[PDB]
Amino acid sequence: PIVMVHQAISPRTLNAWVKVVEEKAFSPEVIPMFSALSEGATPQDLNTMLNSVGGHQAAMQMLKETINEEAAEWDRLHPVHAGPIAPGQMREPRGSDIAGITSTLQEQIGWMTHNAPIPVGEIYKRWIILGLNKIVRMYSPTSILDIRQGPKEPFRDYVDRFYKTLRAEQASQEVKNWMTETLLVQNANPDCKTILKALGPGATLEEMMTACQGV
Amino acid sequence: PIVMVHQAISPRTLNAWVKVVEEKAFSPEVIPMFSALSEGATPQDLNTMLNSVGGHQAAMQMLKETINEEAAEWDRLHPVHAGPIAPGQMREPRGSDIAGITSTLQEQIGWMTHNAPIPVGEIYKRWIILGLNKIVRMYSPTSILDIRQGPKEPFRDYVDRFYKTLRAEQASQEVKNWMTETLLVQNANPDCKTILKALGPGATLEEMMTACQGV
Amino acid sequence: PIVMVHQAISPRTLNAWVKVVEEKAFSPEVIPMFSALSEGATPQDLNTMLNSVGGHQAAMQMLKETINEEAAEWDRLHPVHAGPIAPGQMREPRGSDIAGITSTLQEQIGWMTHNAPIPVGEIYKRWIILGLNKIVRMYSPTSILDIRQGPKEPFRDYVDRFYKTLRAEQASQEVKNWMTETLLVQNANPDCKTILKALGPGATLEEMMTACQGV
Amino acid sequence: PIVMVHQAISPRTLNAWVKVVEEKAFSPEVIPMFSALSEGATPQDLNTMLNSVGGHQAAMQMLKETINEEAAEWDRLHPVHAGPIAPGQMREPRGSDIAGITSTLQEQIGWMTHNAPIPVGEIYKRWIILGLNKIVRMYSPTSILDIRQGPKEPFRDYVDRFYKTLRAEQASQEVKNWMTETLLVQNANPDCKTILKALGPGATLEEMMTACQGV
Amino acid sequence: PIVMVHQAISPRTLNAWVKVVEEKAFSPEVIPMFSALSEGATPQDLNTMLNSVGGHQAAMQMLKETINEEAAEWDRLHPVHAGPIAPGQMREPRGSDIAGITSTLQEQIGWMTHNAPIPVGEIYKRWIILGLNKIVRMYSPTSILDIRQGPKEPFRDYVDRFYKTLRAEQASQEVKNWMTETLLVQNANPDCKTILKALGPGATLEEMMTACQGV
Amino acid sequence: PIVMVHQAISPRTLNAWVKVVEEKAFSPEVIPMFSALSEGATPQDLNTMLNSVGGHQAAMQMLKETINEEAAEWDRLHPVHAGPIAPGQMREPRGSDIAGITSTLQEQIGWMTHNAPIPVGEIYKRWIILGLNKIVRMYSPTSILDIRQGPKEPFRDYVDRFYKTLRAEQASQEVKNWMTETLLVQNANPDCKTILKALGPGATLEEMMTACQGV
């Protein structure tokens, strides 16, 4: 990473990433952990992290297709200019330079370090996180429409399932807000559903959980 | 975190937090450990810590509702002023800027680092700890009124149960002082209760435990 | 801690403390380990360490009663003066300021860092260690008067038991010196007791253990 | 390594390398991990890493034959000049000097540190990674022509196998692009093969996996 | 420790020491490990290390008796002078000041740090290592006179036993040299004894082990 | 070690060394690991590492005999000069000063640090590695003349055995080159032996292993 001078990615950081992928597969929390293990990383470092994954190769191919798309959008949105690079400047970074394919570690340290800086590590990380989100959507087992409280399921476990499935869903904040605003009370079991309908449309989750607590 | 320059949150700190949540669920000691693992953290770091939790999603939703309330109270209590930000200054932080939603890492490092500083990491941490306290109250099994010494329970185990349940209770220092002042002696078993009533209302816990030791 | 600038307490230091309390309960060695894990700590750090303990709540209540007593003795022994604090100075620390209750981390770093310094971390640590000693006395199973060598117990195991129980006892160096000077030889089994009585009152433990070695 | 001054390779880095070779044998991910554990390494450090491997001696001999070839190509491509080395300069590095055989640690730190620098650590690492790639090709069990989807195999597992075997293959990006462009759809089972043939030759892997998802 | 400014002893160093005592008891290698974990330590640090030992209290009492003797020899050999300590100087350290009993951490950092320095940490460590050697002698099971090669024992195992027991013995280099010079060949089994007697009195251990290898 | 100022050897480095000796006994890879854990070490550090080994005492005695020989060769090759050491200089190091016997840590830091420097740590390490090589030769079970491919042994396992045994052999690069040049093809089983004899005397190990792959 870069912290300002450049460090190598640590054996502990990399190892941590590997163990995360092995254990948690592609659960949502994988992405923050990644974003934490990859904080201040260069495209070489990120490439190292993705490469360290054995197995899960289908997902990885999806991810590099996403990276390809974002790199091409970068290229069309940033047309390269022809001409000799001045002494005090650096060349213009292509989409492949953001993904670490056609760029050296010194060039990455250059763009991140030299002034008027381009944060290629954070741009590449953004693309990677896009692909990862698409993957978590891909491998999510459930859909929020199918989370229904059981007749003998305590309210709390039903809310755990509900907001896990909701974390996994592909929707804007307004659509998720609508799903909370509608399905949670709608798809509780008859008893808790009557209690919550008696609370009103403006009660907080704390009040709803305390209300259906003994139930 | 920030220690003055900015570090990334370490794989060991994050991993420690994750293991704490897995093992201890939402016991009181979770909150100090958090406050220790999150010492000097940015809202991005705190967001990373909360995001790293798989499962327990109901509690997390409660927590972000708490964060929403505290952010809105901040917003009404700090009305934003319209006008162009001067060169030597920074913009005014909204409630969403405290929670890391609408603010960049460089803006957080700005408010914490630049002089006349606003400790947004400690404010956000305060809100988070508020929500966590509400959660520990939520998931506490017992109430202090129900801790009664058993006929064959040694005094020490009864005091362990009593002050654990008392740690979990939602009450001011004066109400807790009253609970110690009344229920502990009141709800001991008849033998120890007679001994402690013989000691008087001004004896220390050391003297009470030494008195009912052989009992 | 503070090492001069202020660090946060590490996940490894805290975790180590927690494991010590879990495994060794309240054995004497707990207190040095504490004093080692808490070296150069602030009252916030010490509070974090005590708070990280789940269970053992009776002992913790005893400990905060001890802290209360030492804080009140500090308060009566250091009467606060009324008047406006000058620019180049800091306020006077109360007993509650030593225990981290009514003081900020910056105020603690102030008293420890600013010149004419008050080591509030070492004072608070002294109070805590007082309470811990009282606890180790509380939970010690044995009394030094009851350590008697068995008929078939090797001398070395008897000395191990003897000086463990002696480590746990509440007595000045002169009283412990008397206990060594009397009970160790007095309460050995008849054979070793006759050997040691034949050595004389001025022989060292090395000579006593070598004498009763084959026995 | 060198980070600018020279460090020793850490017990944790070396140990990590050893464990990687023990567990993962010669899977592709071994090479990135190596390239990560060996970041900024000297030829002495790399030699230490290769030497720390017990067993797998056939592969190691293959690797030092590769290193020999690359060193001889370096030697013929860089003919050494006869004459006394000036005070302000260093000698010219042979192929054996790149591999750490005939060069001291101070000479390596010289070439990497002194200006007009020669990155002998990265050149040697390049040769080593060449040999490692040849080894991974050697020990790969399968060939991409033999990955055929089973009648009851979900599409995702078939893509995992396919792009693992494809990661192990020895082919340029254009040949791999052709293999993706042809065999993946060609060698799916009849059902998924008909679905994918119905999608068209321009569909992305995400669309193909979503299409054959329920299948 | 002190490395120049003062560090606290690390949780890892202390924990390592504890585990060493638990596992290896009082084997010779305990003393180097100690001397390595205690490198550059203050008497407070060393006291922490000895205090962290639970159990083995007989040995510890022997050790503090040794420390007492060495402190008294220091006191008689360094008579304290009466008079007011000058501003630019420090007081004279007693034997109890070397053992950390009657001296503050700042006074130890003073003697070790301030010029014309007294290395009280290395003196105290010397005394401690004296006591530890006396303990290893105490708990050694065997005597070098009793190591005799078995009729079917390979020569190498007999030499392992011999030089382990010889490591544990209390003797000068000349007495140990005599023991090697005599007993090793003398107390081998008849076959190897005849071979070694045929080699001569000037053969090295390598030659002796190669000679009795097949035997 | 020394990295320029002097560090203590770490608990992790030492512990790593101990575990290496426990697990791998005296396999070849022990020596690089040593040379890596001992990088930049002082004779005190190296002495600590050798001392930390429990058991294996025969080998250790062989090693200190080797160290004695190399020290005596140093002494005869470096005759000490009589006369008072000038202020700006240091004394001349004996062979015993290289091995840490008759020299202080400050004298070692002097020779390594002060200019016109003598690297006594690397000289002592050279002697130690000499003894270690002699030991690995001592405890090697096999001889390269006895590695013969089995009738049903795959070629790769036979090459693993062959170059392991070859790593353990005591021979110059030319003798090892002859052993590769002759015995490997000579001592394969009849089938692979005929294939390899058909390849020719100039084929690489890669080609030989690919040739006898299916066999």
Ligand SMILES: Cc1[nH]c2ccccc2c1CC(=O)N[C@@H](Cc1ccccc1)C(=O)N(C)c1ccccc1
């Ligand atoms: C962790 C989680 N669960 C969800 C369910 C549905 C939709 C999204 C999610 C998420 C990700 C998620 O929302 N993570 C939160 C951090 C967080 C985690 C846990 C509790 C409180 C705050 C986050 O990244 N931000 C910016 C945020 C912070 C405060 C309030 C609102 C949002």
Ligand SMILES: Cc1[nH]c2ccccc2c1CC(=O)N[C@@H](Cc1ccccc1)C(=O)N(C)c1ccccc1
């Ligand atoms: C740990 C604990 N147990 C309780 C029972 C009832 C109510 C609250 C609690 C707590 C939290 C709790 O009170 N923690 C203590 C620290 C502490 C922990 C353990 C022993 C002594 C001091 C704390 O945060 N402060 C500021 C404090 C310090 C000294 C005296 C009084 C309070």
Ligand SMILES: Cc1[nH]c2ccccc2c1CC(=O)N[C@@H](Cc1ccccc1)C(=O)N(C)c1ccccc1
């Ligand atoms: C560890 C221990 N065992 C005891 C038995 C009875 C009374 C007290 C104790 C103690 C605590 C104990 O005495 N610890 C010792 C350190 C120590 C530990 C072990 C061996 C030698 C020195 C200590 O803190 N100091 C200041 C000390 C140092 C040297 C001599 C005498 C005292």
Ligand SMILES: Cc1[nH]c2ccccc2c1CC(=O)N[C@@H](Cc1ccccc1)C(=O)N(C)c1ccccc1
């Ligand atoms: C990891 C992997 N799987 C393959 C299958 C066939 C051929 C090669 C490979 C590889 C190595 C592989 O291609 N690793 C990638 C990094 C990577 C890994 C995983 C997902 C996305 C990006 C890499 O090194 N670079 C330079 C790269 C980066 C972005 C897009 C394309 C290439």
Ligand SMILES: Cc1[nH]c2ccccc2c1CC(=O)N[C@@H](Cc1ccccc1)C(=O)N(C)c1ccccc1
């Ligand atoms: C480890 C050991 N085994 C013994 C048997 C009998 C008497 C003493 C011992 C020792 C302690 C022992 O002798 N340790 C050695 C270090 C050492 C350890 C192992 C092999 C070579 C060198 C030591 O401290 N010094 C100063 C030393 C160094 C080189 C040659 C001779 C002595």
Ligand SMILES: Cc1[nH]c2ccccc2c1CC(=O)N[C@@H](Cc1ccccc1)C(=O)N(C)c1ccccc1
């Ligand atoms: C590891 C090993 N196996 C052997 C078999 C027979 C004789 C010696 C050995 C060795 C030690 C061995 O040769 N280690 C190699 C490093 C190495 C290890 C593994 C693969 C490639 C390079 C080494 O130290 N040097 C200086 C070296 C480097 C490149 C080419 C040739 C030699």
Ligand SMILES: [Cl-]
């Ligand atoms: Cl690391």
Ligand SMILES: [Cl-]
């Ligand atoms: Cl690691």
Ligand SMILES: [Cl-]
């Ligand atoms: Cl998944």
Ligand SMILES: [Cl-]
């Ligand atoms: Cl790769």
Ligand SMILES: [Cl-]
């Ligand atoms: Cl940009």
Ligand SMILES: [Cl-]
């Ligand atoms: Cl951008």
Ligand SMILES: [Cl-]
């Ligand atoms: Cl679910």
Ligand SMILES: [Cl-]
């Ligand atoms: Cl949407």
Ligand SMILES: [Cl-]
């Ligand atoms: Cl509920």
Ligand SMILES: [Cl-]
């Ligand atoms: Cl880390």
